[PDB]
Amino acid sequence: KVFGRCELAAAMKRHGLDNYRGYSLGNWVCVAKFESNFNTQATNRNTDGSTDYGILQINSRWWCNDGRTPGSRNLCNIPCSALLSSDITASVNCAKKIVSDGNGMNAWVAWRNRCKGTDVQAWIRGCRL
Ligand SMILES: [Cl-]
Ligand SMILES: [Cl-]
Ligand SMILES: [Cl-]
Ligand SMILES: [Cl-]
Ligand SMILES: [Cl-]
Ligand code: NA
C-alpha cells in the first residue's frame, strides 16, 4: 500500500506516534517519506546482508526475523514479513521500541540526515487530524 501523506499522518496518530518519546508527528511522516516513499512494501538490502522492511525500513539485523540474517536478533519478536502489511500496526509498535533504545530517532540515519533540524510540521500541514 502506498499511503497518502495525510492518511499516513492520521494512521500514525491513531497508533500513538504523535509526540511518542517527544517526537512530534511530522518527524514520523518525514522519516517514512525518505525511508519508503510511504510504500508499506518497500524492502532494501544492507551491505552486511540484513534487510530493511516496510514503511519505516526496520532492519532485520536487530528488530525482526527473516530467516536469512545470520547472527541477527529479533528484538521486536516479529517476522519481517509482518512489517510489509498494509496495516501499519506492526511497524509502529516496533518503531516504538527502536526509538526508545537510547538514540531516539537517530536510530534512523535518514531522520538524522533529512528530518532532524528541519521544519517537520510541514509534513502534516493541512491534514485534518
Ligand atoms: Cl508527499
Ligand atoms: Cl510535527
Ligand atoms: Cl536470521
Ligand atoms: Cl493502518
Ligand atoms: Cl530523544
Ligand atoms: Na533478525
Numbering used by the authors: 1 to 129
Give the text the authors published on this PDB structure.
Genetically encoded caged amino acids can be used to control the dynamics of protein activities and cellular localization in response to external cues. In the present study, we revealed the structural basis for the recognition of O-(2-nitrobenzyl)-L-tyrosine (oNBTyr) by its specific variant of Methanocaldococcus jannaschii tyrosyl-tRNA synthetase (oNBTyrRS), and then demonstrated its potential availability for time-resolved X-ray crystallography. In contrast, the genetic encoding of caged amino acids offers a more facile and robust approach for biosynthesizing the photoresponsive proteins. These synthetic amino acids are recognized by specific variants of aminoacyl-tRNA synthetase and attach to tRNA, which in turn translates codons (mostly the UAG stop codon) assigned to the amino acids. Thus, cell-free protein synthesis of caged proteins with oNBTyr could facilitate time-resolved structural analysis of proteins, including medically important membrane proteins.
HEWL_Y20oNBTyr was purified from the cell-free reaction solution and crystallized using the sitting drop vapor diffusion method. The HEWL_Y20oNBTyr crystals yielded datasets at 1.44 Å resolution with completeness of 99.6% and a CC1/2 of 0.980. The crystal structure of HEWL_Y20oNBTyr contained one protomer in the asymmetric unit. We observed a continuous density from the tyrosine residue at position 20, in which the nitrobenzyl group could be unambiguously modeled. The density corresponding to the distal part of oNBTyr appeared somewhat weak, and the occupancy for atoms of the nitrobenzyl group is relatively low (0.5–1.0). On the other hand, the nitrobenzyl group forms an electrostatic interaction with Arg21, but is exposed on the surface. Furthermore, the molecular geometry at this position does not affect the crystal packing environment. Alternatively, light contamination during protein synthesis or purification may have caused slight damage to the caged structure. These results confirm that efficient cell-free production of lysozyme with oNBTyr does not occur with any nonspecific suppression of the UAG codon with natural amino acids in the cell-free synthesis reaction.
